């Protein structure tokens, strides 16, 4: 799979994260990210996708070693961690045919797993609108504890 790059943007309190909501197959909430182009460096792809999806340019804030990377079904997703972005920042996608909405969410209120359906004796997981964000929540919480405390 082609790697994806993007960002976990946090505000100044470190309480909130910026998620974006797409359409159709991308209809839920997720971190801003997208597919790397031929010959494009990871940091440039992260900045490009985030600027396309949010209108906010992270290029001056990216730290090379500060990211969470996950491999999910054989596709690598790396999100650079970008703290301290004011909550009154005006975010606007370039792409509103791709992005429905852009919101801050409390990190502590976000799920870090899906819920099963053990009440119904049925296998699998209940739908959750944060499903794409979910895999990064626990690693982010652990990263913030280690880096800031
Ligand atoms: C399968 N699937 N469901 C949700 C998402 C996703 O990425 N959600 C956020 C998003 C990121 C970039 C966008 F351009 C649009 C939306 C995916 Cl992938």
């Amino acid at each position: 799979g082609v790697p994806t790059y993007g960002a976990i943007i946090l505000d100044e309190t470190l309480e909130n994260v910026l998620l974006v909501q797409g359409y159709l197959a991308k209809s839920g909430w997720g971190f801003p990210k997208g597919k790397v182009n031929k010959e494009e460096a990871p940091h440039d792809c992260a900045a490009r996708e985030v600027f396309e999806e949010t209108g906010f340019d992270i290029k001056d804030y990216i730290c090379k070693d500060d990211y969470i990377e996950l491999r999910i079904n054989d596709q690598l997703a790396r999100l650079y961690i970008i703290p301290g972005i004011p909550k009154d920042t005006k975010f606007n996608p370039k792409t509103r045919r791709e992005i429905r909405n852009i919101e801050w969410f409390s990190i502590e209120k976000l799920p870090c797993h899906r819920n099963d359906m053990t009440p119904k004796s049925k296998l699998g997981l209940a739908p959750n609108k944060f499903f794409m964000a979910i895999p990064f929540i626990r690693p982010l919480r652990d990263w913030l504890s280690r880096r800031f405390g």
Side-chain angles (χ1 to χ4, degrees), residues 7-34 36-37 40-51:
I8 298 169
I9 296 163
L10 304 95
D11 65 338
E12 57 258 275
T13 75
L14 315 167
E15 286 171 297
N16 304 295
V17 290
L18 194 74
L19 305 183
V20 302
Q21 182 186 36
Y23 291 109
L24 298 170
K26 301 186 167 178
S27 184
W29 287 92
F31 297 99
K33 67 180 185 88
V36 67
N37 293 327
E40 177 181 44
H43 77 266
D44 289 311
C45 173
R48 182 176 52 79
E49 293 286 350
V50 173
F51 187 73

Side-chain angles (χ1 to χ4, degrees), residues 121 123-133:
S121 302
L123 299 194
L125 290 173
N128 187 289
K129 58 177 182 181
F130 294 112
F131 68 100
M132 285 300 292

